[PDB]
Every structure is written in structure tokens, then in C-alpha cells.
Short mmCIF file of C-alpha atoms and ligand atoms in Angstrom, two decimals:
data_model
loop_
_atom_site.label_atom_id
_atom_site.label_comp_id
_atom_site.label_asym_id
_atom_site.label_seq_id
_atom_site.Cartn_x
_atom_site.Cartn_y
_atom_site.Cartn_z
CA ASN A 1 67.00 104.94 99.43
CA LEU A 2 67.90 108.00 100.29
CA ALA A 3 69.02 108.29 104.22
CA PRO A 4 68.06 111.82 105.56
CA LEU A 5 70.55 114.42 107.20
CA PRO A 6 71.74 113.56 110.03
CA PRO A 7 71.41 117.50 112.61
CA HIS A 8 75.63 117.82 112.47
CA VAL A 9 75.93 117.69 108.23
CA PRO A 10 74.56 121.48 107.04
CA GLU A 11 72.37 120.73 103.87
CA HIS A 12 74.22 122.70 101.18
CA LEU A 13 77.13 120.72 101.41
CA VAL A 14 74.44 117.85 100.75
CA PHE A 15 75.26 116.18 96.74
CA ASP A 16 74.01 112.68 96.07
CA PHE A 17 77.10 110.75 94.52
CA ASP A 18 76.06 106.76 94.61
CA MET A 19 78.44 105.71 94.35
CA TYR A 20 77.45 101.94 93.37
CA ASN A 21 75.95 103.44 90.33
CA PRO A 22 76.37 107.46 89.61
CA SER A 23 73.92 109.12 87.42
CA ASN A 24 76.60 109.91 85.22
CA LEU A 25 77.48 105.47 84.56
CA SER A 26 76.76 105.93 80.47
CA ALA A 27 79.01 108.48 80.21
CA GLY A 28 82.17 106.14 81.42
CA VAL A 29 83.04 106.18 85.02
CA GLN A 30 85.46 107.90 85.74
CA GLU A 31 83.56 110.87 83.77
CA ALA A 32 80.48 110.28 86.37
CA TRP A 33 82.94 109.81 89.11
CA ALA A 34 84.24 113.47 88.41
CA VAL A 35 80.99 115.46 88.19
CA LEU A 36 81.92 116.14 91.85
CA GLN A 37 84.61 118.21 90.33
CA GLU A 38 82.78 120.41 89.26
CA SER A 39 83.16 124.36 89.67
CA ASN A 40 79.54 124.81 91.86
CA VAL A 41 80.60 121.12 94.42
CA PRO A 42 82.18 121.70 97.42
CA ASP A 43 85.50 120.58 98.29
CA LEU A 44 83.77 118.38 100.73
CA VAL A 45 80.27 116.76 100.38
CA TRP A 46 77.30 114.82 102.14
CA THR A 47 75.63 112.10 100.10
CA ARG A 48 72.60 110.89 100.93
CA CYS A 49 72.88 107.63 99.33
CA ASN A 50 74.22 104.02 100.52
CA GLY A 51 73.50 105.32 104.00
CA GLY A 52 74.80 109.00 104.06
CA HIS A 53 78.76 109.17 104.05
CA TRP A 54 81.14 112.17 103.52
CA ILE A 55 83.03 112.46 100.28
CA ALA A 56 86.47 113.96 99.47
CA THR A 57 86.55 115.14 96.19
CA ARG A 58 90.07 117.01 95.56
CA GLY A 59 92.93 115.39 96.03
CA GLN A 60 94.15 118.03 97.89
CA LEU A 61 91.85 116.13 100.46
CA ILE A 62 92.14 112.91 99.76
CA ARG A 63 96.04 113.26 100.26
CA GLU A 64 95.61 115.12 103.73
CA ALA A 65 92.40 112.66 105.02
CA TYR A 66 94.34 109.29 104.02
CA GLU A 67 98.35 111.35 106.02
CA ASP A 68 95.25 111.78 109.06
CA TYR A 69 94.72 107.91 110.24
CA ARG A 70 94.54 109.32 114.45
CA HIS A 71 91.47 110.65 112.49
CA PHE A 72 90.52 109.44 109.50
CA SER A 73 90.55 105.15 110.46
CA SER A 74 91.07 102.59 108.74
CA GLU A 75 89.34 100.27 111.20
CA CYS A 76 84.99 100.53 108.50
CA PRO A 77 86.43 101.24 105.29
CA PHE A 78 83.61 100.44 102.72
CA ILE A 79 80.88 101.94 102.19
CA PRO A 80 78.16 100.31 103.02
CA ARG A 81 78.58 100.90 107.47
CA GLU A 82 77.45 97.33 107.09
CA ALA A 83 80.24 96.31 105.09
CA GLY A 84 82.63 98.04 106.48
CA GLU A 85 81.51 97.13 110.12
CA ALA A 86 82.09 93.39 107.84
CA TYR A 87 85.14 94.56 106.43
CA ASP A 88 88.68 93.12 108.89
CA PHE A 89 91.76 92.29 106.40
CA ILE A 90 94.84 91.95 106.67
CA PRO A 91 96.71 94.98 107.21
CA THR A 92 94.32 96.75 105.67
CA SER A 93 91.28 96.81 108.88
CA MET A 94 95.12 98.49 111.03
CA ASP A 95 96.46 101.35 111.72
CA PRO A 96 99.51 102.53 112.83
CA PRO A 97 100.74 101.31 114.66
CA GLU A 98 98.93 97.45 114.83
CA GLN A 99 99.67 97.60 111.08
CA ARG A 100 103.00 97.61 110.74
CA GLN A 101 103.70 94.06 110.98
CA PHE A 102 100.83 92.39 109.17
CA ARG A 103 102.38 94.98 106.40
CA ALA A 104 105.47 93.44 106.10
CA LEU A 105 104.08 89.72 105.02
CA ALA A 106 102.26 91.01 102.85
CA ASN A 107 104.71 93.02 101.24
CA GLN A 108 106.93 89.99 101.93
CA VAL A 109 104.54 87.82 98.93
CA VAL A 110 103.41 90.95 96.49
CA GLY A 111 106.79 93.08 96.77
CA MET A 112 109.30 93.85 94.36
CA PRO A 113 111.70 90.91 94.96
CA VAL A 114 108.00 88.15 93.79
CA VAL A 115 108.34 90.42 90.48
CA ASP A 116 111.98 89.52 89.66
CA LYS A 117 110.90 85.75 90.32
CA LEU A 118 108.32 86.10 88.56
CA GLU A 119 109.38 87.35 85.41
CA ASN A 120 109.99 85.22 82.99
CA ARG A 121 105.92 83.31 84.30
CA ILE A 122 104.94 86.71 83.58
CA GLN A 123 106.02 87.36 80.45
CA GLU A 124 105.31 83.87 79.00
CA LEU A 125 102.02 83.99 80.52
CA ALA A 126 101.14 87.06 77.69
CA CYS A 127 103.17 85.67 75.00
CA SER A 128 101.47 82.83 75.57
CA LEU A 129 97.62 83.75 75.89
CA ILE A 130 98.18 86.76 73.77
CA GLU A 131 99.18 83.49 70.98
CA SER A 132 96.34 81.66 71.29
CA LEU A 133 94.04 84.83 70.60
CA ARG A 134 95.98 86.62 67.13
CA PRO A 135 94.98 84.33 64.84
CA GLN A 136 91.41 84.73 65.56
CA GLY A 137 90.74 88.79 64.52
CA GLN A 138 88.41 88.96 67.92
CA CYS A 139 88.13 88.47 71.44
CA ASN A 140 85.66 89.53 74.92
CA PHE A 141 89.10 91.24 75.94
CA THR A 142 87.89 91.13 79.37
CA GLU A 143 87.39 87.80 80.04
CA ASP A 144 89.81 86.44 77.08
CA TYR A 145 93.21 88.24 78.02
CA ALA A 146 92.24 90.55 81.48
CA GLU A 147 91.01 88.80 83.46
CA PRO A 148 93.48 84.98 82.71
CA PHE A 149 96.76 87.60 82.45
CA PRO A 150 97.30 88.82 86.11
CA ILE A 151 94.54 85.94 87.74
CA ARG A 152 96.74 83.81 86.89
CA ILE A 153 99.59 85.03 87.80
CA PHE A 154 98.71 85.59 90.63
CA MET A 155 97.23 82.25 91.71
CA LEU A 156 100.11 80.67 90.56
CA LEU A 157 102.17 83.49 93.09
CA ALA A 158 99.39 82.24 95.56
CA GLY A 159 99.91 78.24 94.95
CA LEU A 160 96.56 77.96 95.08
CA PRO A 161 94.96 75.72 91.54
CA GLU A 162 93.68 77.60 88.71
CA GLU A 163 90.36 75.35 88.53
CA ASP A 164 89.14 78.16 91.36
CA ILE A 165 89.48 80.97 89.95
CA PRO A 166 85.53 80.93 88.09
CA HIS A 167 84.94 80.44 92.20
CA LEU A 168 87.03 83.18 93.44
CA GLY A 169 86.75 85.84 91.17
CA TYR A 170 83.08 85.37 91.14
CA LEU A 171 83.61 85.51 94.89
CA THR A 172 85.95 89.40 95.43
CA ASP A 173 83.37 90.54 92.14
CA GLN A 174 80.18 91.26 95.77
CA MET A 175 83.14 92.40 97.41
CA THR A 176 84.13 95.17 94.63
CA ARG A 177 81.15 95.49 92.69
CA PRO A 178 78.07 93.36 94.02
CA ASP A 179 74.83 91.99 92.42
CA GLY A 180 72.97 91.33 94.64
CA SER A 181 73.38 87.77 95.02
CA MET A 182 75.96 88.71 98.31
CA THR A 183 76.51 90.83 101.10
CA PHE A 184 79.88 92.41 101.62
CA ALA A 185 80.06 90.48 105.07
CA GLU A 186 78.39 87.28 103.39
CA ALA A 187 81.05 87.29 100.37
CA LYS A 188 84.16 87.36 102.62
CA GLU A 189 83.26 84.36 105.00
CA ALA A 190 82.37 82.97 102.04
CA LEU A 191 86.41 83.42 100.58
CA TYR A 192 87.96 83.03 103.78
CA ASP A 193 85.99 79.84 104.67
CA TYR A 194 87.62 78.97 101.05
CA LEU A 195 90.73 79.75 102.37
CA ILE A 196 91.21 78.84 105.99
CA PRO A 197 91.51 74.80 105.36
CA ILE A 198 94.45 76.08 102.73
CA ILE A 199 96.31 77.14 105.50
CA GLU A 200 96.24 74.36 107.96
CA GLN A 201 97.55 72.66 105.46
CA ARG A 202 99.98 74.98 104.61
CA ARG A 203 101.30 75.89 108.58
CA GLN A 204 102.83 72.48 109.46
CA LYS A 205 104.60 72.00 105.95
CA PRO A 206 105.80 75.90 104.63
CA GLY A 207 106.65 76.33 100.89
CA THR A 208 107.21 79.21 98.51
CA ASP A 209 104.28 80.56 97.55
CA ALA A 210 102.33 83.08 99.06
CA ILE A 211 99.64 81.85 102.04
CA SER A 212 102.48 79.53 103.38
CA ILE A 213 104.51 82.43 104.05
CA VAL A 214 101.95 84.11 105.39
CA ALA A 215 101.10 81.60 107.26
CA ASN A 216 104.36 81.06 108.72
CA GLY A 217 105.21 83.84 109.56
CA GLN A 218 106.22 85.87 112.80
CA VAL A 219 104.24 88.89 114.11
CA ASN A 220 104.92 91.11 116.92
CA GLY A 221 107.22 88.42 118.39
CA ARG A 222 104.18 85.13 118.19
CA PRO A 223 103.55 82.50 114.98
CA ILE A 224 100.64 84.45 113.48
CA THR A 225 97.58 82.86 114.27
CA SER A 226 95.66 80.32 111.86
CA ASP A 227 92.90 83.46 112.02
CA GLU A 228 94.52 86.00 111.95
CA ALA A 229 96.28 84.21 108.20
CA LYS A 230 92.70 83.92 107.22
CA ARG A 231 92.33 87.67 107.68
CA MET A 232 95.38 88.61 105.47
CA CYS A 233 95.13 85.78 102.32
CA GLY A 234 91.40 87.52 102.66
CA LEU A 235 92.80 90.28 101.68
CA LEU A 236 95.75 89.28 99.03
CA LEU A 237 93.14 87.83 97.44
CA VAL A 238 90.71 90.31 96.94
CA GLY A 239 93.41 92.13 95.87
CA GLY A 240 95.09 90.44 93.49
CA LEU A 241 91.93 89.41 91.78
CA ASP A 242 91.01 92.54 91.34
CA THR A 243 92.29 95.44 90.24
CA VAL A 244 95.24 95.07 87.41
CA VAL A 245 91.97 93.02 85.80
CA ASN A 246 89.79 95.82 85.92
CA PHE A 247 92.52 98.45 85.67
CA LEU A 248 93.69 96.27 81.75
CA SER A 249 90.15 96.23 80.85
CA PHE A 250 89.81 100.31 80.94
CA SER A 251 93.16 101.29 79.66
CA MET A 252 92.94 98.63 76.69
CA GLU A 253 89.19 99.76 75.65
CA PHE A 254 91.27 103.74 75.52
CA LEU A 255 93.63 101.81 72.81
CA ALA A 256 91.10 100.12 70.88
CA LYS A 257 89.28 103.77 70.09
CA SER A 258 92.84 105.71 69.96
CA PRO A 259 94.79 104.33 66.69
CA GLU A 260 97.20 107.75 67.52
CA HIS A 261 98.24 106.73 70.57
CA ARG A 262 98.46 103.16 70.08
CA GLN A 263 101.30 104.73 67.05
CA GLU A 264 102.78 106.36 69.72
CA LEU A 265 104.16 103.23 72.21
CA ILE A 266 104.69 100.94 68.52
CA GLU A 267 107.42 103.79 67.37
CA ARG A 268 108.92 105.54 70.64
CA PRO A 269 108.65 101.72 72.98
CA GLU A 270 110.59 102.98 75.64
CA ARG A 271 107.73 105.87 76.24
CA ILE A 272 105.83 102.37 77.62
CA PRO A 273 106.64 102.95 81.19
CA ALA A 274 106.16 107.26 81.20
CA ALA A 275 102.70 105.95 79.79
CA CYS A 276 102.09 103.45 82.13
CA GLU A 277 101.53 105.79 84.89
CA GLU A 278 100.03 108.52 82.87
CA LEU A 279 97.16 105.05 82.30
CA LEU A 280 96.98 104.94 85.34
CA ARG A 281 96.47 108.93 86.27
CA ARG A 282 93.71 108.80 83.87
CA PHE A 283 91.73 105.25 84.38
CA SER A 284 92.74 105.28 88.07
CA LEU A 285 89.45 103.18 89.78
CA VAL A 286 90.09 102.60 93.05
CA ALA A 287 87.34 104.02 95.97
CA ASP A 288 87.48 103.28 99.53
CA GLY A 289 87.26 105.36 102.17
CA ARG A 290 87.67 106.02 106.27
CA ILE A 291 85.89 105.87 109.45
CA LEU A 292 86.51 109.27 111.95
CA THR A 293 87.65 107.86 115.66
CA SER A 294 85.55 111.36 117.12
CA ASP A 295 84.84 115.01 116.36
CA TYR A 296 87.23 116.48 114.38
CA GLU A 297 86.60 120.15 112.17
CA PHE A 298 88.11 118.63 108.62
CA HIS A 299 88.54 122.10 105.64
CA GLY A 300 86.04 124.30 107.90
CA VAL A 301 83.54 121.37 107.91
CA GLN A 302 82.11 119.22 111.24
CA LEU A 303 82.65 115.79 110.98
CA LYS A 304 81.67 113.35 114.22
CA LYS A 305 82.69 110.51 115.08
CA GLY A 306 81.23 107.46 113.38
CA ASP A 307 80.79 109.08 110.71
CA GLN A 308 82.26 107.08 107.55
CA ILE A 309 83.98 109.84 104.62
CA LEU A 310 85.11 108.31 101.41
CA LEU A 311 88.40 108.65 99.68
CA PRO A 312 87.82 109.04 96.54
CA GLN A 313 91.90 107.23 94.76
CA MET A 314 90.26 108.07 91.63
CA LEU A 315 89.65 111.75 91.31
CA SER A 316 93.18 113.02 92.46
CA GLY A 317 94.28 112.50 89.49
CA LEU A 318 91.66 113.40 87.68
CA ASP A 319 91.92 116.86 89.88
CA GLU A 320 91.66 119.98 86.97
CA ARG A 321 93.81 121.57 90.45
CA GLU A 322 96.42 118.50 90.12
CA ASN A 323 96.68 118.04 85.77
CA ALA A 324 95.84 120.48 83.70
CA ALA A 325 93.29 118.61 81.31
CA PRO A 326 92.40 115.10 83.29
CA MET A 327 90.53 113.98 81.21
CA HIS A 328 92.76 114.00 78.33
CA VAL A 329 95.66 111.49 77.70
CA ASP A 330 99.31 112.48 77.02
CA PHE A 331 101.85 109.92 77.68
CA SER A 332 104.42 112.98 77.15
CA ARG A 333 102.77 113.89 80.06
CA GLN A 334 105.00 116.21 82.74
CA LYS A 335 104.26 115.79 86.11
CA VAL A 336 101.60 113.03 86.36
CA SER A 337 100.41 113.54 88.96
CA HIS A 338 97.59 110.64 91.54
CA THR A 339 96.46 108.31 94.19
CA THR A 340 96.00 105.28 91.44
CA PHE A 341 97.73 103.29 94.10
CA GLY A 342 96.41 105.35 97.18
CA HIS A 343 97.97 107.07 100.02
CA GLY A 344 99.48 107.27 103.48
CA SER A 345 100.45 103.82 105.16
CA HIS A 346 98.32 101.78 103.54
CA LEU A 347 99.11 102.93 100.42
CA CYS A 348 99.71 99.78 97.39
CA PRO A 349 102.88 97.19 98.13
CA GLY A 350 101.22 95.25 94.88
CA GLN A 351 101.76 98.67 92.45
CA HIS A 352 104.76 96.93 90.80
CA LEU A 353 104.01 94.00 90.82
CA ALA A 354 100.70 96.04 88.85
CA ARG A 355 103.02 97.97 86.86
CA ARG A 356 105.13 95.15 85.21
CA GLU A 357 101.54 93.45 84.21
CA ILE A 358 100.61 96.54 82.76
CA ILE A 359 104.14 97.57 81.40
CA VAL A 360 104.13 93.36 79.71
CA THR A 361 101.07 93.83 78.84
CA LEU A 362 101.02 96.74 76.36
CA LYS A 363 104.78 95.90 75.73
CA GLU A 364 104.01 92.69 73.74
CA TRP A 365 99.17 92.98 72.48
CA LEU A 366 100.93 96.33 70.88
CA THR A 367 103.52 93.96 68.28
CA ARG A 368 101.77 91.86 68.04
CA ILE A 369 98.44 92.95 67.81
CA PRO A 370 99.04 96.86 66.81
CA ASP A 371 96.27 97.32 65.77
CA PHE A 372 92.14 96.54 67.13
CA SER A 373 88.37 98.31 67.55
CA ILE A 374 86.11 97.58 69.46
CA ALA A 375 83.40 95.20 67.80
CA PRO A 376 81.53 97.25 64.96
CA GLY A 377 77.86 98.22 66.95
CA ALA A 378 79.60 97.56 70.84
CA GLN A 379 78.76 99.73 73.44
CA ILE A 380 81.92 99.14 75.76
CA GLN A 381 79.45 99.65 79.52
CA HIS A 382 81.37 100.50 83.05
CA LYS A 383 80.47 99.52 86.04
CA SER A 384 80.91 101.47 89.25
CA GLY A 385 82.20 100.25 93.26
CA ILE A 386 84.30 100.03 96.00
CA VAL A 387 86.10 99.15 92.64
CA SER A 388 84.58 100.04 88.71
CA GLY A 389 85.29 98.05 85.74
CA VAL A 390 84.24 97.41 81.99
CA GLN A 391 81.85 94.85 82.10
CA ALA A 392 82.60 93.42 77.74
CA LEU A 393 85.09 94.84 75.35
CA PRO A 394 84.85 92.76 72.79
CA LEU A 395 87.89 93.42 70.30
CA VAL A 396 88.62 92.93 66.47
CA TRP A 397 91.91 92.60 64.48
CA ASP A 398 92.62 90.97 60.36
CA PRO A 399 95.31 88.59 61.65
CA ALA A 400 97.41 89.07 58.69
CA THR A 401 98.48 92.67 60.98
CA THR A 402 99.38 89.91 63.29
CA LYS A 403 102.80 89.11 64.92
CA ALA A 404 104.47 86.43 65.91
CA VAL A 405 108.13 87.21 67.51
C1 HEM B 501 96.17 99.24 88.65
C2 HEM B 501 96.22 97.67 89.86
C3 HEM B 501 95.83 98.52 91.39
C4 HEM B 501 95.65 98.73 92.37
C5 HEM B 501 94.62 100.63 91.20
C6 HEM B 501 95.76 99.76 93.43
C7 HEM B 501 94.76 99.85 94.57
C8 HEM B 501 95.31 99.85 95.67
C9 HEM B 501 94.84 101.03 96.55
C10 HEM B 501 94.18 102.14 96.27
C11 HEM B 501 95.18 100.47 98.04
C12 HEM B 501 94.39 101.09 99.16
C13 HEM B 501 93.60 101.29 99.60
C14 HEM B 501 93.29 101.62 100.65
O1 HEM B 501 94.25 102.92 101.39
O2 HEM B 501 92.24 101.40 102.16
C15 HEM B 501 95.94 99.18 97.63
C16 HEM B 501 96.06 98.62 98.29
C17 HEM B 501 96.51 96.94 98.39
N1 HEM B 501 96.92 96.46 97.19
FE1 HEM B 501 96.66 97.20 95.33
N2 HEM B 501 96.01 98.50 93.99
C18 HEM B 501 96.54 97.08 92.86
C19 HEM B 501 96.99 96.25 92.37
C20 HEM B 501 97.81 94.85 93.41
C21 HEM B 501 98.25 93.46 93.35
C22 HEM B 501 98.40 93.40 91.64
C23 HEM B 501 97.79 93.47 94.78
C24 HEM B 501 98.51 91.94 94.72
C25 HEM B 501 98.20 91.63 95.61
C26 HEM B 501 97.71 94.28 95.04
C27 HEM B 501 97.94 93.87 97.30
C28 HEM B 501 97.39 95.23 97.36
C29 HEM B 501 97.72 94.51 99.20
C30 HEM B 501 97.40 93.63 99.93
C31 HEM B 501 96.99 95.83 99.59
C32 HEM B 501 96.89 96.87 101.40
C33 HEM B 501 97.77 97.57 102.05
C34 HEM B 501 97.29 97.71 102.96
O3 HEM B 501 96.56 97.35 103.15
O4 HEM B 501 98.39 98.50 103.26
N3 HEM B 501 96.91 95.33 94.66
N4 HEM B 501 95.88 98.99 95.91
C1 CAM B 502 89.92 98.60 97.74
C2 CAM B 502 91.10 97.68 97.67
C3 CAM B 502 91.98 98.14 96.48
C4 CAM B 502 92.75 97.60 98.24
C5 CAM B 502 93.12 96.15 98.19
C6 CAM B 502 91.49 95.34 97.90
C7 CAM B 502 90.51 96.68 98.39
C8 CAM B 502 89.63 96.29 97.71
C9 CAM B 502 90.64 96.33 99.85
O1 CAM B 502 89.59 95.90 100.22
C10 CAM B 502 91.97 96.98 100.00
C1 CYN B 503 94.84 96.32 95.41
N1 CYN B 503 93.76 95.90 95.54
K1 K B 504 71.21 118.51 109.14
K1 K B 505 85.91 97.19 110.55
K1 K B 506 87.16 89.76 90.65
#
């Protein structure tokens, strides 16, 4: 279950952290990962879990490694190694310079101009969901809002039918938080196979949706191939169907549990964008990594060619060296430092869509359903993985306190 220590890895750096089932999970997932930042724990450790890999535990090291693509390559960015080796998504599995032509196309389909284009749709969807939900006095938040709000927006953006959401959500779940029904590679291939006939249909007759744009793109002075388009659309789907969905649940769980923080935003709505950034720091949720292109000494530690190193995006903003009292949510925090959207050349291009979705959710939910709580009895369970998430979030409220605008 624990893989034997490789000869080059010193024993005193061993810390057996399981990224898919961390010891302290019951305390909350961010808290569970934060054990890597207790004072005894070295800045850079090796876990024997999940095949054996390095973990950088401080924001300083995490940022530094993400800037150095020469040594820390994204060709194999997932743990376990078998998943990383099968990982061939575009642009994420590519380093500069090769990454750049494909990254331009990815940004074209999720960037700010798309957010601006979809402004009314995003607003309308949040409004419609909340209006349907508010008179009920309860919801399963993950299922009833956290999933459908960003996913319907993504399927819209992608020109894909909503009928396919359960299938696609399942497949993407398996690549970030596998339940054991599928390997990463099996889930990837299933997603690729879903997309290829759609890509083939849309290559011929080009359109406005993300899949058409990718499929009709130009890269390296030539048409993008169907297979390249497949590798990129696959990534876009993983990106569009997981991170915002799970982040919204962390944020709403917190708000459900902190009336004082709800009040701040209700009474001072101009603070919502800042609050969004602080929630992005505190409830950061992504952890992937890189692979060593050659033997390299890093912060006094001998990394060997082929070693995998987890560089948890989640940990930077929780580092007390970066943010004092890091587990405390302060919407008035002066310098919100985080790498929630990553760092280096793979810095998330979808972050503007994400922020808009978070901000619209905060504004509309908190004003229409200002007063809500976790259902009595309930204990909220988190799950850990490449993207961490909330399993279920039962909320209750008095419908009489709710607003239609
Ligand atoms: C709270 C929301 C989000 C979070 C925390 C997040 C996080 C991240 C992180 C950490 C990376 C870099 C991974 C790495 O360096 O290996 C990334 C990349 C990426 N994200 Fe997001 N993201 C969010 C929203 C979105 C959305 C809404 C989309 C829409 C499609 C999206 C699309 C992408 C794409 C295409 C990449 C790959 C960029 C590249 O490889 O050059 N993201 N994201
Ligand atoms: C780690 C990510 C968040 C980033 C975009 C989707 C994701 C799961 C990837 O495979 C790359
Ligand atoms: C990005 N997801
Ligand atoms: K050793
Ligand atoms: K790979
Ligand atoms: K998913």
C-alpha cells in the first residue's frame, strides 16, 4: 500500500500523505492538507502513498517549481504515475513552447470575451434556479445548484446537449476523485470517444460554440487535427464540469455556517468581489503536479529524472508565511495571496468565467435567500483528489424570508 522508498530519497523527508484519502479528512479537506504545513514538516517531503511522489508544502516552493518548466514538466501531471502517463490532454500536458498555439485556442473559448458574451445567460440561469428553489425551503445544494449552474453554462458554451450531463459529470468525476469504477485512462478514453464524433460533425460546418472553434482552429500554421481537437475538448470538459462546481459548495457550506459573513455581503455588496477572492484562497481545491525532466537539486533535495512532484495549488494560500491566520476567512484581508488558479504558463484561462459565476452566485443567492443553514443533524463530508469536493450539502431556510427581485 505504501511503495518502498527509492534509494535517492532520504528517509527523514518521508511523510506518508495520501492525496486521495488524507488522514485528517473529517476535519475538512483544506484542514486535512494543511497538516503538511505543521512546523515539524519539511518544506519538501516524499510520500510513499499512491506509488511514491514528492510534495512541495510551501507557497514559495510551489510557485518556484511552477515557473521552472525546464525541470518540472507537465507531460505527466497527475498522480498516480499510470494516470499521469495516460494524461495527454491539451494544452495541459504540454510545456512551452509547444503549449502556446493550443493554449491560445483554449483561451479563445473560455476567456473574458466569452464571459461578456454570456453575461445575461449567466445571470438568467442563476436567477431562474434560485427562483425555482427558494419557495421549497430546502435543497441538496451540490445537486440542485452547484452542479447545474456552472454545468449548464458550460454546456451552453460548448454547444452540447444537457441530456448528456449525468454521463459527462460521472466521467470527469473519475479523473479527479475516482471511486474505483474506472482508471483515469479509461475515463479519459470514454470522454474522448464521446467527443470525437461531435468534433467530426463540427469540423465541416464551423460554428460559435467552443467545440466548433477548437475543431476549426489553426495551430503551428496548419489546421488542428481531429485528434488534437479531441485532446483539447476533453480537457475543456474536465475543466468546465468540476472545479467551479465543487468550489461553489465549499463556499456555500462556509456561508451556511457563518451568518456573520452572509451579513457582511448583504449589507456591503461592493465587497463581494473581494470576498470572492478570499473564498478562493480559503477554499482552494486543486492539487496536481509535474514530472522531473532530469536529475535536479531543488532546495537542497536531490530530485531524480522521472520523479513526480505534487505541487498543490491549494496549499499556497493556506501557507501562514503567505497569509497570517490562514484558516480564518477575512473579507477585509489586505493582501490575499493564493495560487488557486495555478501559477506559471498553465495559469487557468477559465478563471474569469469562474469568478463571474462565483460573484453572480454570491450576489443573487445572498439577497434572495439571505438566511439559510445546514440541515439539522447533517455532517458535511468532503472528498479529496486532484480536485477536492463536497459530497453533499443539505440546506434549509424559511421560504417566507426569501425574495424575488
Ligand atoms: C474555481 C474555479 C477554477 C479553479 C480553482 C481552477 C483551477 C485551475 C488550475 C489550478 C489550473 C492549472 C493546472 C496546472 O497548472 O496543471 C487550471 C487550468 C485550466 N483551466 Fe481552470 N480553474 C477553475 C475554473 C475553470 C473554468 C470555469 C474553466 C472553463 C473551461 C477552466 C478551464 C481551464 C483550462 C482549459 C486549463 C488549462 C490551461 C493550460 O493548461 O494552459 N477553468 N485551472
Ligand atoms: C488540474 C485541473 C484543474 C486543470 C484543468 C482541469 C484539471 C483537472 C486538469 O486536468 C488541469
Ligand atoms: C480548471 N478546471
Ligand atoms: K533512500
Ligand atoms: K502523459
Ligand atoms: K465532475
